[PDB]
CSV table of C-alpha atoms in Angstrom, one decimal:
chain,number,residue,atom,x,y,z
A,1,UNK,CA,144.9,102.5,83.0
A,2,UNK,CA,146.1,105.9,84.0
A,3,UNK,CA,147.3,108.6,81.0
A,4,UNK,CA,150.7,110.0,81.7
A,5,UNK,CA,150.4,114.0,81.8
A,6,UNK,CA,152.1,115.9,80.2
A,7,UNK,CA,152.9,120.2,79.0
A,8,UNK,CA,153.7,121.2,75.8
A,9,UNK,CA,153.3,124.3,73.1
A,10,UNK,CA,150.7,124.2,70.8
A,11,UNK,CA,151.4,126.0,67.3
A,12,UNK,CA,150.6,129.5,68.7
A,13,UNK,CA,152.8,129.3,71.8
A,14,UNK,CA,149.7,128.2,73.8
A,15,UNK,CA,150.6,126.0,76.9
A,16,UNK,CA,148.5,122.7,76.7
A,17,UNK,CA,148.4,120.3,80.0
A,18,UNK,CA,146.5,117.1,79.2
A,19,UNK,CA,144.7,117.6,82.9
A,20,UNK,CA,143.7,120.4,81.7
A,21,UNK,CA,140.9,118.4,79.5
A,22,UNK,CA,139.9,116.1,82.1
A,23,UNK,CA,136.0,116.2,81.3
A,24,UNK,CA,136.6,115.9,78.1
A,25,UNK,CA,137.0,113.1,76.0
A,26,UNK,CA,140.7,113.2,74.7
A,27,UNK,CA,142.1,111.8,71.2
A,28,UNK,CA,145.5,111.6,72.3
A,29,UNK,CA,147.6,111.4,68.3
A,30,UNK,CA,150.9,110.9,67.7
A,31,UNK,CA,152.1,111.8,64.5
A,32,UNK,CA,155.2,112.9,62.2
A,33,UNK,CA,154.5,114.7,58.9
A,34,UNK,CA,156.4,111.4,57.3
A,35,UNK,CA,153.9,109.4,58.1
A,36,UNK,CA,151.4,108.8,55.1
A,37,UNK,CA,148.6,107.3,56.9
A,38,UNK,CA,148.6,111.0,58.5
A,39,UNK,CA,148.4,112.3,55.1
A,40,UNK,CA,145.1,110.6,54.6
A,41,UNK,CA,143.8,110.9,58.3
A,42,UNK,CA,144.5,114.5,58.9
A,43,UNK,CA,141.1,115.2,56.3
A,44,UNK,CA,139.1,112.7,58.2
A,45,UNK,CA,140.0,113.8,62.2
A,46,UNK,CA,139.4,117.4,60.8
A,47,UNK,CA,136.4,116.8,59.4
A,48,UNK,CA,135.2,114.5,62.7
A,49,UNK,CA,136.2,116.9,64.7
A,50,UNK,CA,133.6,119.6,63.4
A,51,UNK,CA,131.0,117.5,64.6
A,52,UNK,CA,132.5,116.0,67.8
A,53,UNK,CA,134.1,119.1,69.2
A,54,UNK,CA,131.4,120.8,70.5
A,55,UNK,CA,130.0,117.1,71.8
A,56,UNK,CA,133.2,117.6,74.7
A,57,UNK,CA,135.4,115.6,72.6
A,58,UNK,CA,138.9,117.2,71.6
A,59,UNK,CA,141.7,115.8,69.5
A,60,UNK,CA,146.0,116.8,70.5
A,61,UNK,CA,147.7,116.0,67.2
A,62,UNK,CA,151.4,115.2,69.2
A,63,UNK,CA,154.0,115.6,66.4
A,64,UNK,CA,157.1,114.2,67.1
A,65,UNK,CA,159.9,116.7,66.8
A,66,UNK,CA,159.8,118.2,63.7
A,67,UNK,CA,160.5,122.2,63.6
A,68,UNK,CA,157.8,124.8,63.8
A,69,UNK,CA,157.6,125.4,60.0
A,70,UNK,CA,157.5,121.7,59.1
A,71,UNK,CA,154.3,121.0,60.6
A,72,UNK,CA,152.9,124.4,59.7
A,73,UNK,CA,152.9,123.7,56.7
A,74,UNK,CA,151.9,120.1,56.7
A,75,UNK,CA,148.9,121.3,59.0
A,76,UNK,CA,148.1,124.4,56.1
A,77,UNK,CA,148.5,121.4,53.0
A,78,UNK,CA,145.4,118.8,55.2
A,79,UNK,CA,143.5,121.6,55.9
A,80,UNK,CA,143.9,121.2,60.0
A,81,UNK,CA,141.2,122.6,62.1
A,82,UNK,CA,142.2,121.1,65.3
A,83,UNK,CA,144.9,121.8,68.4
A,84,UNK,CA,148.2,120.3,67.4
A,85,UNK,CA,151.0,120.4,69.9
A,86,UNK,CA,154.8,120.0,69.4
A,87,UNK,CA,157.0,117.4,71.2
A,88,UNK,CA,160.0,119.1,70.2
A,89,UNK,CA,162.5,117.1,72.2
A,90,UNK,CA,160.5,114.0,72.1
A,91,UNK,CA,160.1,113.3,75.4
A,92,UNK,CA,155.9,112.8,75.9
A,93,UNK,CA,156.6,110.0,72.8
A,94,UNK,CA,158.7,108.1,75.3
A,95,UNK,CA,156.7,108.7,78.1
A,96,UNK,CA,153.7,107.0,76.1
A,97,UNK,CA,156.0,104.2,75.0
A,98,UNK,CA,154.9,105.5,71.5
A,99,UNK,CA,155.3,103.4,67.8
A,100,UNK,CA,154.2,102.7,65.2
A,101,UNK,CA,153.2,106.2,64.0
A,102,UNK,CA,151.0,107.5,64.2
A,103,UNK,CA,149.2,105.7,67.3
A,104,UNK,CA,146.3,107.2,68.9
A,105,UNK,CA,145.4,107.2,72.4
A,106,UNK,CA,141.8,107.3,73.1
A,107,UNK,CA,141.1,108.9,76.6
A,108,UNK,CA,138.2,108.9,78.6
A,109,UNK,CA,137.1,112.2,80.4
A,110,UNK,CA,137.9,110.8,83.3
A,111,UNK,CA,141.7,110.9,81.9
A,112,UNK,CA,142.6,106.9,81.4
A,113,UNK,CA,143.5,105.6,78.5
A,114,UNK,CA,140.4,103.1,76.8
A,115,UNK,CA,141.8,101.9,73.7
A,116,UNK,CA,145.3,102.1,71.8
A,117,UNK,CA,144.9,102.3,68.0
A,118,UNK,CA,147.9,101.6,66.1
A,119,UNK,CA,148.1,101.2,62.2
A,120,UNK,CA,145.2,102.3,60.3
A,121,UNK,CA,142.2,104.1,60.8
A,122,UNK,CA,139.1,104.7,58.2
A,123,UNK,CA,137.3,108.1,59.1
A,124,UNK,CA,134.2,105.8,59.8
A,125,UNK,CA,136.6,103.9,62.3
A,126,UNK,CA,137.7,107.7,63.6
A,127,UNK,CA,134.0,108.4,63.9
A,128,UNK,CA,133.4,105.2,66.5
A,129,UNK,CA,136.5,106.1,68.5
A,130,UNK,CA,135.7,109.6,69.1
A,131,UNK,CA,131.8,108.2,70.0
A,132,UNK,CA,133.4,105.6,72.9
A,133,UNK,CA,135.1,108.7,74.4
A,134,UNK,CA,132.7,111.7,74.3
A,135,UNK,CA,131.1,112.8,77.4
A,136,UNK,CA,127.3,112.4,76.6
């Protein structure tokens, strides 16, 4: 089931187009700095991703809307290591029909959407998910 596209800044300015990572596997996150499972899964996605990114596997943090410095800050506090992207008038949240938050999205590489996670997620959990989307 197809994965609506979609072009937003990262947190350098940096233009990000979800097409762009087709080949890769994508774990599509939305997220607000509210959130407190985000508190506790921030760690565990960072520290995934130092294994899985260089396996073709790439994580987009969404936030939702929140100013520049907000998430800055919240990214600095969980030690983020991975591409975050700002929704700043929360348009790509309604175009993915988006809440609870967070909700993942895990996309395939070849850019549909394999599995909705919603609620919780353990980093063991985080592990499997970004395994059922990486390329190889």
């Amino acid at each position: 089931s197809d994965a609506p596209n979609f072009v937003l800044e990262d947190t350098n300015g940096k233009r990000i187009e979800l097409s762009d990572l087709k080949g890769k596997g994508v774990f599509l996150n939305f997220w607000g700095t509210w959130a407190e499972p985000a508190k506790k899964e921030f760690p565990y996605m960072a520290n995934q991703y130092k294994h899985f990114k260089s396996q073709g596997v790439e994580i987009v943090a969404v936030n939702v809307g929140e100013s520049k410095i907000a998430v800055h800050n919240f990214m600095k506090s969980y030690g983020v290591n991975f591409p975050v992207v700002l929704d700043t008038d929360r348009q790509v949240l309604d175009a993915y029909d988006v809440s609870p938050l967070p909700t993942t999205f895990l996309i395939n590489p070849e850019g549909k959407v394999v599995k909705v996670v919603t609620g919780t997620m353990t980093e063991s959990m985080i592990h499997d998910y970004m395994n059922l989307i990486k390329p190889g």
